[model samples]
Target: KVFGRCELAAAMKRHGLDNYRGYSLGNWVCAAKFESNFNTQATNRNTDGSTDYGILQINSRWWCNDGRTPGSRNLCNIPCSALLSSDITASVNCAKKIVSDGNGMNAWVAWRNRCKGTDVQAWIRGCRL
Candidate 1:
């Protein structure tokens, strides 16, 4: 499902992206916004032949296995199709795994180019919980 700004912020916070590692709730929301426009079903195949899946656009080459990437690591230990579901639960868990593995939010070019050092307060301004 497509999520609204505050809706996604609350979900990410509850899912643990808030204060996760060094990234804040806003950082997660902002990255998701720029990456997939809050679209759970979004997927983009890179020229390298690896595909990005879901709201966070988790990569198949290193994270989820899409049964296509030649050398997918499946680091998240899940099928890439799981990331396309509207429920962000699997996506969140996989993202935590990705960050816990040292990729950090920096793994997302969207976060690196769009969220780093920026004030994300406005994005979560009225978000509750």
Candidate 2:
């Protein structure tokens, strides 16, 4: 039951992320918890008069949802609402991919290992996320 799509909105299926990466999974889960507490529907109105939207707290208006690309009019980098609507696993998988691709899993591993469990220094050590 995807928001507006008639077909079943299998985000995990669509993304092909069922196979969990080893340390990557740990990093993904930890980062998800650290970032939004696994809250896919989380949204925050920034103090700078901006809005952060979706799971992983992506700034939809800036990151992807604002029609930046040419081919996919509605879709952009990622649509996290799938996690909010009917797939937390999808959210975890999606966030992991985003983090992994943008900043390999080591960044997350270091985040867990160093920085006292919460430091940007560790995240930037390897992957630079």
Candidate 3:
């Protein structure tokens, strides 16, 4: 399901991304906007023959296994489909693990290519947080 900006903000607030994993709320919201536009089922096939899964657009190459790739690390220990849920519990938990393994939101290419070093407030502008 697709979520509105306010809904995403409230979800992030409740999900504890602000301090739970040492990233700002805006960073998480910005990554979501660029990665999946708040659509829980969002998926994309990369040119590298890997797929990004769910709202966070996590990579299959190193994170979750999409089954098409053999010998995946599956470090999150969750299926790619689990990341597609609108409920976001699994996705958030997996994202926390991803950030814990890397440099915060930099784990996401979306954050590096787009949201990084920008005024992320535009992502949550006018949203009630």
Best TM-score among the predictions, by candidate number: 1
lDDT of 1 by residue, 9-116 (tens): 988988888988878888888899999999999999899999999999999999999999999999899999999998899999999887787767788898889987
Q: What is the RMSD, in Å, between candidate 2 and the native fold over all Cα?
A: 10.5
Q: What is the C-alpha RMSD of each candidate to the true structure, in Å?
A: 1.1, 10.5, 1.5
Q: In candidate 3, what are the lDDT values of residues 10-104, reduced to their tens digit?
A: 89889887666666778888899889999999999988887898989887878888898666888888788888988988888888988998587
Models sorted by TM-score, best on top: 1, 3, 2
In terms of TM-score, which candidate is stronger, 1 or 2? 1
lDDT of each: 0.90, 0.41, 0.84
Better of 1 and 3 by lDDT: 1
Give the higher-TM-score candidate: 2 or 3.
3
Clashes of each: 0, 0, 0
The worst-scoring run of ten residues by lDDT in candidate 1 lies at 120-129
lDDT of 1 at 9: 93
Pairs with backbone N, CA or C atoms under 3 Å apart (clashes), candidate 3 = none
> Which stretches of model 3 miss by more than 4 angstroms?
none
| Model 1 TM-score (2 dp) | 0.95
Model 3 lDDT-worst window of ten: 16-25
